[PDB]
Design a protein around this ligand. Structure first.
Ligand SMILES: CCCCCCCCCCCCCCCCCCCCCCCCCC(=O)N[C@@H](CO[C@H]1O[C@H](CO)[C@H](OCC2CC2)[C@H](O)[C@H]1O)[C@H](O)[C@H](O)CCCCCCCCCCCCCC
Ligand SMILES: *[C@@H]1O[C@H](CO[C@@H]2O[C@@H](C)[C@@H](O)[C@@H](O)[C@@H]2O)[C@@H](O[C@@H]2O[C@H](CO)[C@@H](O[C@@H]3O[C@H](CO)[C@@H](O)[C@H](O[C@H]4O[C@H](CO)[C@@H](O)[C@H](O)[C@@H]4O)[C@@H]3O)[C@H](O)[C@H]2NC(C)=O)[C@H](O)[C@H]1NC(C)=O
Ligand SMILES: *[C@@H]1O[C@H](CO)[C@@H](O[C@@H]2O[C@H](CO)[C@@H](O)[C@H](O)[C@H]2NC(C)=O)[C@H](O)[C@H]1NC(C)=O
Ligand SMILES: *[C@@H]1O[C@H](CO)[C@@H](O)[C@H](O)[C@H]1NC(C)=O
Ligand code: NA
Ligand code: NA
Lengths: 239, 270, 97, 203
């Protein structure tokens, strides 16, 4: 029994309208919306016993729920506030006590969008010193100059995502810690065997999925509109 | 000989927020317990109402019921949300649960549920079921209630084991109250070209009684017994009427037979 | 919604001037919200005891009100019931006869 | 303050060590208790569900107990691995059906420090694939007794340490990265850190 949530990540402005959606093809009557905040357990916002039914949970204020069909249960923030910055979890169930949770949705509500900026991405190739010393090859990916800090960095070898040999900084660092709306940098490493990096049919790509503005978001500044987008950097193996 | 033990629960749900649950317990026609909504604990209405249960067994049984009352209240409220807008407040739910005790160690247990004054649901064997005549929408509540294995196991144990055990002990402990004999007292009166004679019989226990208008040795088959009406002191009241032509009341008597009189019938002549 | 039956009767044989108990037995009503008053000469009697509400095999509710009273030639006694199933309150007078 | 309390709030253990997590609750009634594992930024993975008055369960290296009389549950992790690094959440369901509400604990954060067998600390310079006239400095292959300090200069950037796992080779290594447009060389990059003496600086 599987549950899906969209979007998986969203940056929004105060006063904006945000809709979080949950889809469920198990033919479960019952669906449930929670938020998770540091220092608290998951708290119930709204739930539904079927199409057309919505019920208030423990913390319903500032949220509207919508159940247009058995399959879809939506959480609507009509006038988003920063206090709604959170991780949102949807779940479904039948008559039994088990609730099957979705993968979660991260929401950041900013006061203002004026500083939103996508990353620059650079891929740094392995040191020949490292190769001769360890028979291993470490690639470094660097995402810089981005705001806010909602990014997903991933590695791709020949068009397929790799997890083994990867580690990414647990949080971005601030480029100007002094300033209020500092841009961030984030680094990640992929370490392979020298022979793997030395094979020139191997294509390496580091990809950053940046969450920013939507199509419908107003934009008054000169510079390019900093929309949700992918930025990547790429290199081929070599002897 | 045969005694039925009845736990009666009455629950009013006026709207989403407001509800109250009150209970009374009967062994035969004597009240053994009371459980007001206002009270955290079950009240004994007899000295012997705990039966042969230790204080620890009673506490544990009471605790189970305390959890039940709070849980029941929330479950109904959630079931209404689940069925909305098919059903709406106000809502009355009644439960009648207990056992009928037979000679031997033989007994039959029951648990019957009424919704808006109509018997719709019982517990039978190992599960909740609707009974004939019940509306189809109850199939979803039943399905949800039957998902709860824990409640099923508890109810089975209450019905199969706890009820007969408890009531056996009650019968022992309360023997002297159950077997009491209280004498009827009678008096006559009349109302309205026909007249109605009335034989009033009051204060008798137990319930079984015989009351007949007579002319000497001839039973007046026009005699009409009313219903048994309760007194506050756990005795019974009954009246027998006879419609007669005015100035025809000479030589009519009211005869009362009851177990408490030990052969000495009451005879009141007009 | 069924209309409450009311029966008024004394515990002991009625003798003018002698203390006694007056019973008001209200039956066959639902829903169970009900207001019962026992009246002396149309005035509400203060200290009226109520049994716990219960119900019969047919799921209809009943309750017993009672109060101490001393009958006389002059004084009247009644039981007055308000229930949603009736437009106006119903009053049954104690006869004795 | 809440109906489900977990202890400890957080703990740090070394790879191979066992640990015990506690959950105490006041929820009534208590139909069942579930333990969840939540990786950083991920979802809820069920580890076990306890239902009996005095229950015991197991699931590989995880085992759990429930005492309903004491309203207490423990989760035991045997021989911790790096991937046990996660938040562990306790949940009490108050019904054996969908009429139930879930009562979530705030969670316990576990960090497992990995075992570095053959440390080989070194500082390498990596060049950009495109515009090759800029670079980063990689401090790698140091054991977990080594602590990486932030930069003195604030136009020099240094990440915290991070451990990767080359699963097919059964090999783990720590690393940190430094860079700057300022002057900056890899010999100077980690000066502000107590780094090993045998650290390899090639060239
Ligand atoms: C019955 C006679 C017993 C003999 C002794 C009596 C002598 C003492 C005098 C008694 C005085 C009080 C009498 C008045 C009450 C008479 C009612 C009798 C019926 C009692 C039913 C008791 C049910 C007990 C269980 C219970 O509380 N369930 C409740 C709590 O359950 C939770 O906690 C449990 C703890 O034990 C267990 O978890 C523990 C795990 C298993 C280990 C459960 O798994 C867990 O889900 C549960 O919410 C239950 O659903 C409550 C309602 C059940 C009755 C429903 C009636 C059907 C109504 C149909 C509605 C249709 C209308 C829709 C709009
Ligand atoms: C409590 O007592 C009840 C029976 O008493 C009745 O209900 C009470 C609540 C009360 O009102 C009493 O006054 C009243 O008389 C027990 O209920 C019986 O439970 C058994 C098993 O637990 C049921 O037997 C089953 O019958 C099914 C046919 O519909 C059948 O499918 C089942 O098969 C199972 O077993 C066979 C092996 O023979 C296996 O092949 C299957 O795979 C499966 O396991 C099973 O045979 C009775 O039908 C129930 N009786 C009624 C009338 O419904 C209850 O168990 C008992 N509980 C306790 C804890 O004592
Ligand atoms: C019947 O009893 C219940 C339980 O005692 C009452 O519900 C409580 O009401 C108080 C104050 O009104 C609240 O603070 C509690 O939260 C309620 N308790 C529970 C367990 O929910 C209910 O109000 C009573 N009904 C009436 C009409 O008096
Ligand atoms: C709910 O019902 C009660 C009892 O009749 C009533 O007094 C109260 O006003 C009602 N509350 C609401 C919110 O309708
Ligand atoms: Na390298
Ligand atoms: Na790091």
């Amino acid at each position: 029994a599987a549950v899906t949530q969209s979007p998986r990540n969203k940056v929004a402005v105060t006063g904006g309208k945000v809709t979080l959606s949950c889809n469920q093809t198990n033919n479960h009557n019952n669906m449930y919306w929670y938020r998770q905040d540091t220092g608290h357990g998951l708290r119930l916002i709204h739930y539904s016993y079927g199409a057309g039914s919505t019920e208030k949970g423990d913390i319903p204020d500032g949220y509207k729920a919508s159940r247009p069909s058995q399959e879809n249960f939506s959480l609507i923030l009509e006038l988003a506030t920063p206090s709604q910055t959170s991780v949102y979890f949807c779940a479904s169930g039948d008559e039994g006590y088990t609730q099957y949770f979705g993968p979660g949705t991260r929401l950041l509500v900013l006061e203002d969008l004026r500083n939103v900026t996508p990353p620059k991405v650079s891929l740094f190739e392995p040191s020949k010193a490292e190769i001769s010393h360890t028979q291993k090859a470490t690639l470094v990916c660097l995402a810089t100059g981005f705001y806010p800090d909602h990014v997903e960095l991933s590695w791709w070898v020949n068009g397929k995502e790799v997890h083994s040999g990867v580690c990414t900084d647990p949080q971005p660092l601030k480029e100007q810690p002094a300033l209020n709306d500092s841009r961030y940098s984030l680094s990640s490493r992929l370490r392979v065997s020298a022979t793997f990096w030395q094979n020139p049919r191997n294509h390496f790509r580091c990809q950053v999925q940046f969450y920013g503005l939507s199509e419908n978001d107003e934009w008054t500044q000169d510079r390019a509109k900093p929309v949700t987008q992918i930025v990547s950097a790429e290199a081929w193996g070599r002897a | 000989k045969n005694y039925t033990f009845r736990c009666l629960q009455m629950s009013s749900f006026a709207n989403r927020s407001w509800s109250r649950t009150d209970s009374v317990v009967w062994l035969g026609d004597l009240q053994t317990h009371r459980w007001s909504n206002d009270s955290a604990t079950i009240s004994f209405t007899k000295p012997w109402s705990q039966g042969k249960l230790s204080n620890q067994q009673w506490e544990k049984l009471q605790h189970m019921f305390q959890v039940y009352r709070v849980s029941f209240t929330r479950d109904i409220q959630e079931l209404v949300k689940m069925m909305s807008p098919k059903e709406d407040y106000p809502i009355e739910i009644q439960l009648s649960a207990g056992c009928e005790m037979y000679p031997g160690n033989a007994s039959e247990s029951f648990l019957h549920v009424a919704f808006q004054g109509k018997y719709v649901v019982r517990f039978w064997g190992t599960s909740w079921q609707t009974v004939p005549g019940a509306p189809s929408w109850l199939d979803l509540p039943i399905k949800v209630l039957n998902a709860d294995q824990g409640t099923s196991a508890t109810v089975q144990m209450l019905l199969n084991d706890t009820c007969p055990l408890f009531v056996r002990g009650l019968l022992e402990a309360g023997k002297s109250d159950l077997e009491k004999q209280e004498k009827p007292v009678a008096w006559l009166s009349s109302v309205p070209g026909h007249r109605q004679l009335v034989c009033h019989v009051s204060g008798f226990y137990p319930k079984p009684v015989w009351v007949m208008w007579m002319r000497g040795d001839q039973e007046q088959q026009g005699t009409h017994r009313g219903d048994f009406l309760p007194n506050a002191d756990e005795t019974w009241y009954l009246q027998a009427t006879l419609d007669v032509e005015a100035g025809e009341e000479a030589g009519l008597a009211c005869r009362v037979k009851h177990s408490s009189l030990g052969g000495q019938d009451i005879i009141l002549y007009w | 919604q069924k209309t409450p039956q009311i029966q008024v009767y004394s515990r002991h044989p009625p003798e003018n001037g002698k203390p006694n108990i007056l019973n008001c037995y209200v039956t066959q009503f639902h829903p169970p919200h009900i207001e019962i008053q026992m009246l002396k000469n149309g005035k509400k009697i203060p200290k009226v005891e109520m049994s716990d509400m219960s119900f019969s095999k047919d799921w209809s509710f009943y309750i017993l009100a009672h109060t101490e009273f001393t009958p006389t030639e002059t004084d009247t006694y009644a039981c007055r019931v308000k229930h949603a199933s009736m437009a106006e309150p119903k009053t049954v007078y104690w006869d004795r006869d | 303050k809440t109906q489900v309390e977990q202890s400890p709030q957080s703990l740090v253990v070394r790879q191979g060590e066992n640990c015990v997590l506690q959950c105490n609750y006041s929820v009534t009634p208590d139909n069942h208790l579930r333990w969840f594992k939540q990786d950083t930024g991920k979802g809820l993975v069920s580890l076990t569900v306890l239902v009996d008055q005095k229950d015991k369960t197991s699931n590989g290296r995880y085992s759990a107990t429930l005492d309903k009389d004491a309203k207490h549950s423990t989760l035991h992790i045997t021989a911790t691995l790096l991937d046990d690094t996660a938040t562990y959440i306790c949940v009490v369901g108050d019904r054996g059906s969908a009429l139930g509400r879930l009562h979530f604990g705030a969670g316990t954060q576990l960090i497992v420090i990995p075992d570095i067998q053959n440390p080989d600390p070194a500082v390498y310079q990596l060049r950009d694939s495109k515009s090759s006239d800029k670079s980063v400095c990689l401090f790698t292959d140091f054991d977990s007794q080594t602590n990486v300090s932030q930069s003195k200069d604030s136009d020099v950037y240094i990440t915290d340490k991070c451990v990767l796992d080359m699963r097919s080779m059964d090999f783990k290594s720590n690393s940190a990265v430094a860079w700057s447009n300022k002057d900056f060389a890899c010999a100077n990059a980690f000066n502000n850190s107590i780094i090993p003496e045998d650290t390899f600086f090639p060239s």
